[PDB]
Each structure stands twice: as structure tokens, then as C-alpha cells.
Paper text:
BurB, a SET (Suppressor of variegation, Enhancer of zeste and Trithorax) domain-containing enzyme identified from Burkholderia thailandensis, initiates DMSP synthesis by methylating methionine (Met) to S-methyl-methionine (SMM), with S-adenosyl methionine (SAM) as a methyl donor. BurB is a S-adenosyl methionine (SAM)-dependent Met S-methyltransferase containing a SET (Suppressor of variegation, Enhancer of zeste and Trithorax) domain, and belongs to the class V of the methyltransferase superfamilies. The SET domain proteins are well known for their roles in methylating histone lysines in eukaryotes, and BurB represents a new member of the SET domain proteins. Each BurB monomer consists of eight β-sheets and four α-helices.
The crystals of the BurB-Met complex belong to the C121 space group, with two BurB molecules arranged as a dimer in an asymmetric unit. The electron density map of the BurB-Met complex suggested that there is a Met molecule bound in the substrate binding site of BurB mainly by hydrogen bond interactions. Residues Arg70 and Thr73 can form hydrogen bonds with the nitrogen atom of Met. Met132 interacts with the carboxyl group of Met. Moreover, Val130 participates in Met binding by hydrogen bonds via a water molecule. It is noteworthy that all the residues interact with Met via their main chains, likely to enable a relatively stable Met’s binding pattern irrespective of potential mutations. In the BurB-Met complex, the Met molecule is accessible to the surface, suggesting that BurB possesses an open conformation. During catalysis, Met is firstly bound in the substrate binding pocket, while BurB maintains an open conformation for the subsequent binding of SAM. Thus, the binding of the Met molecule may occur before the binding of SAM in BurB, which is different from MmtN and DsyB.
Numbering used by the authors:
A (entry chain B), C (entry chain B): 12 to 171
B (entry chain A), D (entry chain A): 12 to 169
Amino acid sequence: RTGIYPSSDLKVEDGYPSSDTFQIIQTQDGRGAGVRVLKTFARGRRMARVSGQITAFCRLHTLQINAHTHLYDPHFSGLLLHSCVPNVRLDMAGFELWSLRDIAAGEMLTMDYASTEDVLMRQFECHCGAPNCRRWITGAKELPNDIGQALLAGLRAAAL
Amino acid sequence: RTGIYPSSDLKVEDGYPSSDTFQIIQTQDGRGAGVRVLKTFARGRRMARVSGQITAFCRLHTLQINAHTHLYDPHFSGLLLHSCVPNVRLDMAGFELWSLRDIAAGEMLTMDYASTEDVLMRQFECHCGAPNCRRWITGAKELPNDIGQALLAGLRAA
Amino acid sequence: RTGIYPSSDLKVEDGYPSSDTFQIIQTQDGRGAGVRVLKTFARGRRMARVSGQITAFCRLHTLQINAHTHLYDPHFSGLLLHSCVPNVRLDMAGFELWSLRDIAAGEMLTMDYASTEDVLMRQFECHCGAPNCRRWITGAKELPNDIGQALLAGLRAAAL
Amino acid sequence: RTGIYPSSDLKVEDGYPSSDTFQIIQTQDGRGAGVRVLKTFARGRRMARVSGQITAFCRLHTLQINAHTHLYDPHFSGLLLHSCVPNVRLDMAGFELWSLRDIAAGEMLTMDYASTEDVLMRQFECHCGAPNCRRWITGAKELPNDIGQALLAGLRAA
Ligand code: MET
Ligand code: MET
Ligand code: MET
Ligand code: MET
């Protein structure tokens, strides 16, 4: 079978993601728009092993390993879009992707950025439309920036 | 100030939780019913340092540190009830409680058990009310047992 | 059997240290002078599980867990004396004590402080007398202090 | 400056190793023979940031990150020869190479394989010369195999 990680040392037979199970979804410009699953996963299953390059600096497409070290993965896990009600969890100790919900073929895989990331490279507005969405997305240890308040501290006019 | 953790080694002025900020909710007997905040917390703030005793075995009131080690904390963090839309996050590398969202004084503190735990000592039905609530709660690496599959099926009659 | 950790939740049958295997060695004043073993351990064996209290601050009797968190263990592992040729290793991920060398009953268990500790609460002079001893003991990420140089930067007179 | 790691994502000015500081020693063919420092390093200094590729399987040139994950680094840190009295320490939480003692320009860089590795892809006889050298090298959680027990016994004839 064939794998997403371009390195030849990561084999699909060991658990690494296969293009027969996962699909990188593209924008109009040939950029990032998440990852689509193409087999059906029941919740509580390991969907894939994760790899990448060790780096000391948080960036786009890095995932946090521990307090000072991150995993640079522009091929797979770093492409996952945020959601406030994710269907997948990143286990950054075993380096594995696990189904939180039941996931049907064709569904978009989503993760809560704040469950792994202290801070993000860029805070942003969320469109998962979950009623419990946070609207403005930051790392778990990161305060909203000055744009962030506005959308937040403004949408608190929804008092009425 | 006086602290939730019995140990006199852990000091409130170093960020360990104080009863003037956290109330432990008990039932008619001794079994617990969550932790409530007495003060308001803005999102993205450290609410408390966490502590406990190292142990090798997952248990009631343990939180997972790494693949084979767990933190036994029956005084504070192991008392947090689960929710599928939690207001707090447990950081098990720095051992700290952070607010995921704005928390009003009096609010119950809830965490997603699956975001730290591989497996749970017991699976159980969830009543978080949330629209996206998984209804049946396991560890992240744990399949629903037959009871859980049954309820999950009886709910799939929709 | 009976265990060193005073907490009753840590059982000897699960691997936690027993006073039938280990002995806390005392000074003249009822203070710390290491840990003596009283069974024979071949190298490459797990001698004991380790426990203690989570703390955020490095102290005497704390062992480093990760970049910002330490294990306060005044009962067992924090009593171990330094050596530049240790016979035991602390596995701070599994929380376990393992024999590096062959260890005969009655031997003192010793560990290289710099293999787990970024910095120490107090730097000190070493007396393991190993020919490859470092003489002045610091954490792995810690420079000798101003006393430290002297013993070091002086004992480099041993040029002749 | 030009860096040991092929990846152009890792920059020397951020502390990743440079060939003006580190020389990789090759044998008559392609198999390696250690890493040598070209500059002097005082003890207690960060000599390099480390990197590599995450992998699930212990292997030649992997260093262990945690109980089930390993760092594949055939360019730098996985090339360090073992010594029972090493001059450098690998920090696998911060991913950095630190000097344990004073290191003169030209010196070989050596680490104690047992201080990071549970088990080794292969056990082997050690020639560090040190008085306290264990003579036979395994992982920290690994018993000497029959070859190693034999040599350890043939040495016990002392
Ligand atoms: C999608 S990877 C996790 C977030 C990334 N580090 C960022 O800052 O955008
Ligand atoms: C509230 S502590 C987290 C889960 C606990 N270890 C259990 O199994 O019940
Ligand atoms: C013997 S426990 C490890 C060293 C201790 N943290 C100290 O600073 O002395
Ligand atoms: C120099 S890399 C450390 C050990 C390596 N994993 C091996 O088994 O050979």
C-alpha cells in the first residue's frame, strides 16, 4: 500500500496513514483545507500512527510535544482543521490519531487545537457552528489578542 | 490562605488551590459531586497548580501522566466531573488547571475525561446536556462496553 | 511485607520498595546518608517502583520529571547519594529504579544526579573517588558557581 | 553557517549543529565512527539542538523519547559512540546536547547509551578503557544476552 508521509521509512503496514484511508483536501490555490477520511471508523479506534520532524519552535503545522518541543508535520497531522466538537484526538505521547466519535467515510477529521497547543501561531475565528463553540480560537495557555476581544467582548451583546 | 491539598508542602501563594476559591461538593455521604469555583475566571488563565501521588495503576481519582504512570489526586483534580464541552483543561505536563472559557463564580468545573485518559476505571452515561455530547463516556483508547453499545444503539433509534 | 513509602496505597507486592530489600542509612544526627540494598541484584533488573508527591519547585529530595515538574520523595529515591560511576539509574518516565551494574547485598545505591537533574538546589564536591569523577557536582544544565571554579579551576594545576 | 541536518528548516543560528563545529567520522565505507567536536566546549553548555523523525520502533540510530516512541536521527545524535564515562548528555525532553564535562577541540563525543535507551538494537563489548567500564553494553532495562554473559564471566576470572 501507499502512505502520506513522503519518507520511505514509515510503512502503512505498521499503522502509518495510507492514501487508501485518508485524503488531503485542497483549496482553490493548492493549499490546506483539512483531511478527509475514506474508511468508516467506530469511536475508540487508532486511526493512524503520526510522525514528523522534531523542532524547537511553534509554527503553522507544528503540534506540541511537551513544554518546549514540537512536531513539525506538514504532511498529515498538522493539516487537521480545528473544531470545538472534534471527532479525533491527537495522542502526543504515543504519537497516534484516535477516533473520539463515530466517523463515517467521507467525514472531515477535526481536532480541538487547545487540547494539545499552549499557544498558536495565529489566533482565529471558528466556524464549526457548534452551539458550544468558543468563537475565537487560542492555545490553552493563551489570552485572546486585541482583535480577539472584539469578536468575543462584542458578541456578549447577545445578552439581549 | 488555606489550601485544598492537605500537605503543608503545597502553598496557596505558589498557585495551589485554596478553599476561598474552590469548593468540593459532597453528597449526603462521603462520595463527591464535583468541584465548584467560588470566583470568576477569565478564559486562558491558570486556575491552580495540581499535585498528588505518583502511582503505577489507573484508579478512581487518578489522572494519566504518561503511558504507564498516573497521578493519584483524591483531593482536587480527580474530583472533577466530566463534560463533553468542558470549561477547564488539565495540563498533565506542567500539572496545572487552565480555564478553556469564561467561568462565572459558582460554576461547576468540568473536564473532558477523554482528553487525558486512555481508559477509565468505569464507563458511564453522560448528562452534560450538550448537543454534541457522546452520551457514553470511555477513555480515548477504549471501546464502549456492551452496556455502552446497547445504550448507544437504543439511542440510535432516532 | 512492609514498605518504605509511608502511604498505605503503595504495596510491596506491586513493586514498591520493602524494608526487607532496602535500608535507609542514617547519619549521627538522624539525617540522610543514602540507601543500602540488602538483596543481591544482577544488572538490568527493576529494583523498585518509585512514588512521591508532585511539586513545581526543585528542592532537596526532589527528582526532575520534565522541564517544569519534579517528584518530591523524601522517603526513598530522593535519599540516593551521587556518584560519578553509579550502580543504579532512575527512570523518570516509568518511575522505576533499575540496576546499571551488578549490585551485591550491602552495597550503597548511587545515582548520577546530572542524568536526571537540570540544576541542583546546592552544588557540591564529590567523593566517589572514581578516576573519572567530575569533582564538582552540578545539574546537567548548570554552570559551576563561584566556589565551584576554584576547586575545578584550581585542580587544573595538576597539569604538572 | 551550514548545518549537519540536511533539512533547510533547521538553522544553525537557532542552535542546530554546524559542520564548522561538528565533524562526522566515517570509515573506509559509509558506516560511521562517531562525532568529533572541532571547537572547545566548557562543561554545562548547550552544544546543539537535536532533531530527527518520530518513529514507533527502536532501531539503529534511534534515541528513545518515551516508553513507545523514538527519534530517528542518522545525521547527528544517533551517530554518537557510547562511553561509560561520557562527555555529553542527551536531553530527550528538550531535545538538546549538553556538555557533561570540559571538552577539548578534537575530542570524540560520547554518551552513555543506557542513560536514554531501554533496550539496544544490538549489545556489544565496550572499549572505553575506563576503570569502571561495564565492558558489555545493553539498554538500561535489558539483561546481557548469552554472549554478553559469557564475556562477563570470562572477565570474572580475575
Ligand atoms: C494545525 S497544527 C496546530 C496549530 C499550529 N501549531 C498553528 O499555530 O496553527
Ligand atoms: C476524575 S479522575 C479521571 C478518571 C479516573 N481515573 C477514573 O477512572 O474514574
Ligand atoms: C538527591 S535528589 C536529586 C538532587 C536534589 N534535587 C538536590 O537538589 O539536592
Ligand atoms: C547511537 S543511537 C542509540 C542506540 C540505538 N538505538 C541502537 O540500538 O543501536
